[PDB]
Structure to design on (99 residues):
């Protein structure tokens, strides 16, 4: 129940890694969803790949 | 700096064709391109319409 804007999160340089599967970061601004879930946790750096 | 990349460099300052033939050669620099108090002679495009 909101208007999202993924260009602000994307253009921001603060992120160390950014991998989208199935979607491309520049198309996220047009596409919309039934729901979005944010699964949030901290891991060890070498484990980011997992 | 690779074909089929997007980002603040790929879209605003250096875009390669996605059909690119050639080689990307890179190395770290720390003798010339960096100083104490930072090297502020390096500019990039941060916003473009």
């Amino acid at each position: 129940n909101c208007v999202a804007d993924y260009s602000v999160l994307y253009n921001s340089a603060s992120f160390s890694t950014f991998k989208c599967y199935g979607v491309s970061p520049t198309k996220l601004n047009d596409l919309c969803f039934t729901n979005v879930y944010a699964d949030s946790f901290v891991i060890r750096g070498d484990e980011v790949r997992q | 700096i690779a074909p089929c990349q997007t980002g603040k460099i790929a879209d605003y300052n250096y875009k390669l064709p996605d059909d690119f033939t050639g080689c990307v050669i890179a190395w770290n620099s720390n003798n010339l391109d960096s100083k104490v108090g930072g090297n502020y002679n390096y500019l990039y495009r941060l916003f473009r319409k």
Remarks:
- Chain B touches chain A through two residues (CB under 8 Å).
- DSSP finds no helices and no strands in chain B.
- The two ends of chain B are 21 Å apart (CA to CA).
- The CA atoms of residues 2 and 23 of chain B lie 9 Å apart.
